[PDB]
Amino acid sequence: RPTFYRQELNKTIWEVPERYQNLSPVGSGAYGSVCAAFDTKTGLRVAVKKLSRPFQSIIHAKRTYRELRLLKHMKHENVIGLLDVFTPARSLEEFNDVYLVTHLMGADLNNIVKCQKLTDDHVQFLIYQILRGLKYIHSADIIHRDLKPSNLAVNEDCELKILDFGLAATRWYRAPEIMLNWMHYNQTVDIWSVGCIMAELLTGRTLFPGTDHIDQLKLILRLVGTPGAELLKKISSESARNYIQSLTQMPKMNFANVFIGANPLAVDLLEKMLVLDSDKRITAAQALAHAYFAQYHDPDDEPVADPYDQSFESRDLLIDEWKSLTYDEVISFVPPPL
Ligand SMILES: Nc1c(C(=O)c2cccc(OC3CCNCC3)c2)cnn1-c1ccc(F)cc1
């Protein structure tokens, strides 16, 4: 065991190994608070997230486990991975705190828009990397479910990583089928989000800034068109079906008339991502081979993930059971080679 040391940072205590120095709060992350730190062992800047009350309830305990499991599995250039996980606890009985260490990125996609002027070549590169990372997480039956600018982190290099996958305004980037639970969903819910993000990088404006679920759907159908007969057949919910057919019918628009002056190939890909029918929406693997990414696409360097075991998701266990499983995962963690 290494040597630990303590401090207060904005009304919360952090006990970390001595190898991490110059802790400096950066804000709120998923279920916790994150610090920038310096990693004396590797000379790298890192991000340390302290989970908040990790084992306070069954929900928290299961989610703490889930987050650690997911992060330990991700080994890909465009997905955030685990550099280190630690606790100040010497045994399972005093185990109450979890700290997760990853690379520190420079900004999120939200930040970098209003800072620098995004050319077409930048949008090509950023969306390419998102899709490359989505191919990887999807290949392991993991779905992000809440892809949005604030969980896309990027360096000054323009190198991008996806954060906060597998854990789930947020509503602005949600696929209509999971927001409304109106038809069966799959991995392509994330492709809907990618389309919304790509539209935003090209226009500088949110594509669908709805004030609630109904206004949101309204803004969407104004662009994509109300579902015809072939889509309505696939809607299992009676109430959802009745809302769609009771609305005043909207035509599908010409995306060229909406995304005026955008690269025509970019507009073509948007048209393929922003379809309501999830069985027809382009996948990440198909998207990577679209002509829009000709400059970046390499099929021998778009790898898939090892099998991921999420059978734990269907299980109902006690707090101390989830806690013990997490403890094992902390103990068994082997860091990456540097
Ligand atoms: N690695 C990061 C960041 C970042 O690196 C990040 C994200 C957005 C912006 C950002 O820039 C900072 C540095 C300079 N600008 C302001 C904050 C870093 C944020 N959260 N996490 C994280 C996720 C899971 C974990 F287990 C641990 C940490």
Curated annotation (Swiss-Prot):
List UniProt keywords, sorted A-Z.
Acetylation, Apoptosis, ATP-binding, Cytoplasm, Kinase, Nucleotide-binding, Nucleus, Phosphoprotein, Serine/threonine-protein kinase, Stress response, Transcription, Transcription regulation, Transferase, Ubl conjugation
The cofactors required by this protein are: Mg(2+)
What the record says about activity regulation is: Activated by cell stresses such as DNA damage, heat shock, osmotic shock, anisomycin and sodium arsenite, as well as pro-inflammatory stimuli such as bacterial lipopolysaccharide (LPS) and interleukin-1.
Q: InterPro entries recorded for this chain?
A: Kinase-like_dom_sf, MAP_kinase, MAP_kinase_CS, MAPK14, MAPK_p38-like, Prot_kinase_dom, Protein_kinase_ATP_BS
- Mutagenesis or variant effect for A30V: Lowered kinase activity
Q: Which GO terms describe its biological process?
A: 3'-UTR-mediated mRNA stabilization; angiogenesis; apoptotic process; bone development; cartilage condensation; cell morphogenesis; cell surface receptor protein serine/threonine kinase signaling pathway; cell surface receptor signaling pathway
Entry EC no(s)? 2.7.11.24
CDD domains with a match to the protein in the record? STKc_p38alpha
Question: Is Nucleotide-binding there in the keyword field?
Answer: yes
Q: What is known of its domains?
A: The TXY motif contains the threonine and tyrosine residues whose phosphorylation activates the MAP kinases.
Q: Which PANTHER family match?
A: MITOGEN-ACTIVATED PROTEIN KINASE (PTHR24055)
Instruction: Outline what the protein does.
Output: Serine/threonine kinase which acts as an essential component of the MAP kinase signal transduction pathway. MAPK14 is one of the four p38 MAPKs which play an important role in the cascades of cellular responses evoked by extracellular stimuli such as pro-inflammatory cytokines or physical stress leading to direct activation of transcription factors. Accordingly, p38 MAPKs phosphorylate a broad range of proteins and it has been estimated that they may have approximately 200 to 300 substrates each.
Designated name of the protein: Mitogen-activated protein kinase 14
The beginning of the lineage is: Eukaryota, Metazoa, Chordata, Craniata, Vertebrata
